Amino acid sequence: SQYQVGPLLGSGGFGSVYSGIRVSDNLPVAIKHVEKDRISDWGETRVPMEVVLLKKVSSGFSGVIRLLDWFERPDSFVLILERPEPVQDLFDFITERGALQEELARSFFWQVLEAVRHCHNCGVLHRDIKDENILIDLNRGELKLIDFGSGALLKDTVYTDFDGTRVYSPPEWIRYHRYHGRSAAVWSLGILLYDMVCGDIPFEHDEEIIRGQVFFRQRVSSECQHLIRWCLALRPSDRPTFEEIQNHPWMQDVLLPQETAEIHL
Numbered sequence: 001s002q003y004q005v006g007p008l009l010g011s012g013g014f015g016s017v018y019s020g021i022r023v024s025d026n027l028p029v030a031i032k033h034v035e036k037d038r039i040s041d042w043g044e045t046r047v048p049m050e051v052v053l054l055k056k057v058s059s060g061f062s063g064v065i066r067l068l069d070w071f072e073r074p075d076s077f078v079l080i081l082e083r084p085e086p087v088q089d090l091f092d093f094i095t096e097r098g099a100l101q102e103e104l105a106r107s108f109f110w111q112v113l114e115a116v117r118h119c120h121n122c123g124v125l126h127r128d129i130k131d132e133n134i135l136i137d138l139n140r141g142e143l144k145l146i147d148f149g150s151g152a153l154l155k156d157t158v159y160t161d162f163d164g165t166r167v168y169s170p171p172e173w174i175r176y177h178r179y180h181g182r183s184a185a186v187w188s189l190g191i192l193l194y195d196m197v198c199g200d201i202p203f204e205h206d207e208e209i210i211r212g213q214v215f216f217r218q219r220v221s222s223e224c225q226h227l228i229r230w231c232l233a234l235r236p237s238d239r240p241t242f243e244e245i246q247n248h249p250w251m252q253d254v255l256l257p258q259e260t261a262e263i264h265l
C-alpha cells in the first residue's frame, strides 16, 4: 500500500526482485522478496544477514545499493531498495557490447574497488562480487553493488562457509574449503577485471581455477594483464591489497563517473 509494484526485474538464488515506486514521492524503488525457508544465515530481532549487512553499509553515499526499508511477512522478508534509472547490470552490458575498452574498464573497476573498500571499512564482506551483482546508472556513470545475500560480517579469521558464485571463488576454497575474506575478494576482483577486458570469465572448471593460468583472448595491455595475474595469484598472501591495486600503474588517471558516461555511455 505504501509502494506501487511494477514488473519483475529478476529472480534466482537471491529471491524475486520487482520494479516499484514509492507512492509518497514517486521515488523509483526495487522490491526484493526473500522466502524465509530459503534463508541460511540470520543476524540481529532476528532478520536475514542480508538486512544486517545492508544497514551497516547503507549509511552515507557510496557505490553500494541503499536499503530504504524492509518488512517481515509470515513466510518472507520484503526489502525496499534504491533503484537507479535508467539502469543496466554489468553482465548484460558486457553481453551486448563485448569486451570493454581499458579506459572504460578502468573507470568501472575503480568504482567497484571503492565500493568494496566501503563495505570492508563498514565491517561487511560481500562474497559474491561479479558482473551480475553490479548495476550501472547509465546517465551518471556510477556503479552500484547489489545482492548481499551471500555476504558475512568481515572477520580476520578463516571462513569455512561459501555460497557465492563458484567460478569467482578462489582456489583455496575449491581445494581446502577455507579462505580469508580480503584475499578471496581480491581473487574475485581479478576474475571480474578479466571479464571486463576479455568479455568473458577466465576459468570455468575447478581444475582451471586450481591451475590459475590466465590466457588472453583479446588484446589487453601488459599492465592490465599484470594486475589481473597479480589478483589471481594462487597463494592468497601473494595477492595485492586494495591499496596495491589502486596504486597499480594501470589504475592511474581514472575518469570521473560523469566523464565515463559522456564518453562511453
Ligand SMILES: O=c1c(O)c(-c2ccc(O)c(O)c2)oc2cc(O)cc(O)c12
Pocket (backbone or CB within 6 Å): 009, 010, 014, 017, 029, 030, 032, 065, 081, 082, 083, 084, 087, 089, 135, 146, 147, 148, 149
Ligand atoms: O535496482 C535494482 C536493485 O536494487 C536490485 C537489487 C538490490 C539488492 C539486492 O540484494 C538484490 O538482489 C537486487 O536489482 C536490480 C536488477 C535489475 O535488472 C534492475 C534494477 O534496477 C535492480
